[PDB]
Amino acid sequence: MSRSKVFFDITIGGKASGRIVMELYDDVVPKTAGNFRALCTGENGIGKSGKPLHFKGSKFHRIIPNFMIQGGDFTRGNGTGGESIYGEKFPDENFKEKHTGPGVLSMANAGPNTNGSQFFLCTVKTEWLDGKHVVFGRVVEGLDVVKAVESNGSQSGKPVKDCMIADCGQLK
Ligand code: PRO
């Protein structure tokens, strides 16, 4: 069945750098896709954390060259935070989709069954994450914008400048 389309407009050090367009796999992982969709639109308002359940304004706090760009921590901004629309953590829905190449959209976590709002966009094939992170979508436009963000990461994960999701939402 159906697939939602969502976007991020990115700034890097405040400079507009383009739009990333993502297709979600609502047909394979509807609960996982649906959480991410709602966090793009902001439609579930204020969460248990007291902060908006919305990626807008948040950053890619962890970026690793030749690996992936990671965001979604809109409560702590640093990898410790994030909150799903379901309330904090939800189980791994399935591992039907794999990490096959750059562009893959997958959930960051802290171990089995700990999905929140943190996610990553792969800049390479990361087969070693298969069966441990739930893949729920892929980039279909703006992979160049993904690369631009990637150039600001470091081996340590720390970005050299703020890569921000200046706007986001759903297209259809
Ligand atoms: O941040 C990390 O290193 C792992 C791989 C991406 C999701 N969690």
What's at 170, amino acid-wise? Q
Phi, psi of 168 (to 5 degrees): -165, 165
Where do the domains of the chain lie, and which CATH numbers do they carry? Answer: 1-172 (2.40.100.10)
What residues line ligand 1, using a CB cutoff of 6 Å? 62, 68, 70, 108, 120, 129, 133
Look at residues 114, 113, 169, 123 and name the one whose alpha carbon lies nearest to residue 149. Answer: 123
SS3 of the chain: helix, strand, coil, percent, to 5: 15, 30, 55
Question: Please, which residues have CB within 8 angstroms of residue 84's CB and are 6 or more apart in sequence?
Answer: 35, 90, 115, 116, 117
Identify whether 55 is a catalytic site residue.
no
For residue 52, the 8-state DSSP code is: B
**Method of determination?**
X-ray
Backbone dihedral region of 87: left (phi > 0), alpha (psi from -120 to 50 degrees) or beta?
A: left
State which amino acid sits at residue 92: D
Ligand 1 centroid – CA 108 distance (Å): 6
Pocket test for ligand 1, best of 70, 109, 133, 154 (most atoms within 8 A of CB): 70
Mutate to test the pocket of ligand 1, among 66, 68, 158 (most ligand atoms within 8 A of CB): 68
Cα–Cα distance, 59 to 131 (Å, whole number): 26
**96 CA to centre of ligand 1 in angstroms:** 19
| Resolution given for this structure, in angstroms | 1.9
